[PDB]
Amino acid sequence: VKEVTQNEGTKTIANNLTSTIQVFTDSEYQLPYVLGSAHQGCLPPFPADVFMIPQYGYLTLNNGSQAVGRSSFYCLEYFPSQMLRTGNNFEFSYQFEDVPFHSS
Amino acid sequence: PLMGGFGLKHPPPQILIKNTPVPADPPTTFSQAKLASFITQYSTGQVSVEIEWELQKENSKRWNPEIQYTSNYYKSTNVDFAVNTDGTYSEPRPIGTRYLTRNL
Structure with missing residues (x-):
């Protein structure tokens, strides 16, 4: 975790x-589930890339x-959460529910 | 079901009831024809039906308040879902079951 400040024009990070x-x-699936819309921000294809984590937002019913x-x-x-x-470090495990083989 | 409901393959078995016919006095000389004269008769009683239900409790992290079904706060000539002066029960409006929210 790094703090960054500005003194005139210079930048410094610490x-x-x-x-x-x-x-x-x-x-518990209690939030708008926004994955699966094919948005950007996934891990890069190439292991040597550093990627920026995308911002979370959600849409709700509207009229106009x-x-x-x-x-x-939702707050x-x-x-x-875990601080x-x-x-x-952080970890979790997950087990997929039975699904038909993708037929390739 | 298209009217709404629980489609059942073996629904609750329909219950049939009848007054057993009681003949009026037959003639004193035998006759082949069926007995066409009966005693005017009817029955009354009490019936009870008790259904156990299975509920799915609402578990949600929504911050703001839901929409609830609430009776009219303002004064009225008579209570809704209650008898009038003459003893006539009445139901003022249809009440659907969906006031809670989930994420699609």
Whole structure:
């Protein structure tokens, strides 16, 4: 985790060793599931590329630009998440439900 | 079902009921014809039906409030879903089952 500041025109970057990040996996499927729309931001094809993580957003019922009464608003901080500092790591496992072989 | 409902292959078995016919006095001399004169008769009673239901509890992280079914807060000549002056029960409006939300 790195802090970056601006003094006039110069830039400088430095470790912040106490800083954290927050990671949860939505395993109850309680959020708008936005994967599968073929958006950019996947891991690069080539293992030597460094990639920028895409921003999360979601769409809800509308009428015009206005919102209707069924429109949901989700606050992602309202889930349990795991806070990781520079020494910490994260893991989870997942098991696919039975699916027909892709017929190639 | 296209009207809405639970399509069943073996639905609840239909229950049939009848007043057993009681003949009026037959003639004193035998006759082949069936007995065409009966006692005017009817029956009454009490019936009970008890259905156990299985519920799927709503589990959702939506932040903002849902839409609920609420009775009219404002005054009225008489309560809705209750008898009027003459004892006539009435149901003022059809009530559907979908007020909760999920993510599509």
